[PDB]
Write a protein that binds this ligand. Structure first.
Ligand SMILES: [Ca+2]
Ligand SMILES: [Ca+2]
Lengths: 77, 77, 77, 74
DNA sequence: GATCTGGCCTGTCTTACACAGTGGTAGTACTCCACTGTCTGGCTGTACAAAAACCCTGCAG
DNA sequence: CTGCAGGGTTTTTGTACAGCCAGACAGTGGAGTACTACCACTGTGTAAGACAGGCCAGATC
């Protein structure tokens, strides 16, 4: 919510932990598996009836936006 | 001394480049040593580019270094 | 008189940097064990300096020229 | 060429008159330029009349033995 | 006399190469989970002295 | 006036029974959690080398 870099946050973290620090912020590493609870693709679910033409696999998250564009050159690029 | 100087300053040798003329000099040394430059005292551009290319393939073969156009620090080192 | 510049009263910049390194000079007088009511005068600080300029600096929201290109930063240490 | 004269020329005379070489190069400033850029990127006040004033303020802060000393980093 | 053309310089452009950054990853090393006893030092109910700097007061000058 | 010393005088200071419990010392078996350097990737500045064309010398027109 303040547009800080990961380098930025890590530096600030080490620094403040030096000063009177009982480790206050959390180390960068723990965020990278702390958002697995907030990003897409984490909470099981289903539908009735089953969803048409949309795979019933749920745990996936971010996906490249081409949806399998056959990479053949001569064809439509 | 042609123009009135204005700023007292004891100059010193640049510690940064400090090598680049030395580098290009050893490079010319190798290029003219693959040639017999004191046996043929004045060669034109053809044998120049020839010696360059064979020397650079030699360096890529034994020490594994690409040829370059300008000599930075690390290439000289 | 359009050329825009900012700087310091050189002497004041000095007295700032020196009043900073006060802590270190005092601790160093403590290691050397040199007396204090007798080290009040015979001091000598050596000053380095440098000056270069940056070419045609890139910036944001300057589609037209706002002379945001050249800068020469004169400094000391 | 120039550099060859310089190197085979006077190095002993300099290190005697001075006591070092690398301890007087301008390499430092060439690094510090990076700083300049970034500060202009992220702390200009959007007016060249005020820009350098702000940049200088922040840089001078960034180069105080005081504050780097508060950068223990243990 | 008045002009052509190589020999040479340099001012200008351009082009490879370097840093600069950033989120992700791997490799590494420094902090505790819990078991169990067990020693050390600073807290608590009054009493006795020891030091200490100002204040009075004697008496010396 | 002054300096100096017996005691005052109040404050400060340590030593003093007497019981209690926080806090630490070892180590175990290695997890594991924090840290530190790759790492894939291009944007930005940089400055060596093209180079051309302009100019002087050679020699000419
Ligand atoms: Ca420069
Ligand atoms: Ca520069």
């Amino acid at each position: 919510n303040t547009f800080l870099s990961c380098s930025q946050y890590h530096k600030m973290y080490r620094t403040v932990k030096a000063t009177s620090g009982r480790q206050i912020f959390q180390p960068l590493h723990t965020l990278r598996n702390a958002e697995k609870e907030l990003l897409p693709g984490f909470h099981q679910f289903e539908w009735q009836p089953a969803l048409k033409n949309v795979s019933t696999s749920w745990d996936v998250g971010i996906i490249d936006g081409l949806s399998g564009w056959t990479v053949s050159v001569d064809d439509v690029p | 001394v042609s123009a009135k100087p204005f700023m007292e300053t004891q100059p010193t040798l640049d510690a940064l480049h400090c090598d680049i003329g030395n580098a290009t000099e050893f490079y010319k040394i190798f290029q003219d040593e693959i040639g017999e430059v004191y046996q043929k005292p004045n060669p034109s551009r053809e044998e120049r580019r020839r010696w360059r290319s064979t020397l650079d393939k030699q360096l890529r073969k034994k020490m594994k270094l690409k040829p370059v156009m300008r000599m930075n620090g690390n290439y000289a080192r | 008189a359009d050329t825009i510049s900012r700087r310091f009263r050189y002497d004041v910049a000095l007295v700032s940097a020196l009043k900073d390194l006060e802590e270190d000079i005092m601790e160093g007088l403590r290691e050397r064990a040199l007396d204090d009511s007798m080290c009040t005068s015979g001091f000598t600080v050596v000053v380095k300096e440098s000056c270069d300029g940056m070419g045609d600096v890139s910036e944001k929201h300057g589609s037209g020229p706002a002379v945001p290109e050249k800068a020469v930063r004169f400094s000391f240490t | 060429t120039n550099y060859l004269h310089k190197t085979l020329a006077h190095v002993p005379e300099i290190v005697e008159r001075d006591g070092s070489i690398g301890a007087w190069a301008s390499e430092g400033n060439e690094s510090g330029n990076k700083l300049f850029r970034r500060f202009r990127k992220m702390n200009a006040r959007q007016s060249k009349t005020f820009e350098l004033e702000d940049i200088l303020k922040h840089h001078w802060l960034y180069t105080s033995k005081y504050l780097q000393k508060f950068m223990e980093a243990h």
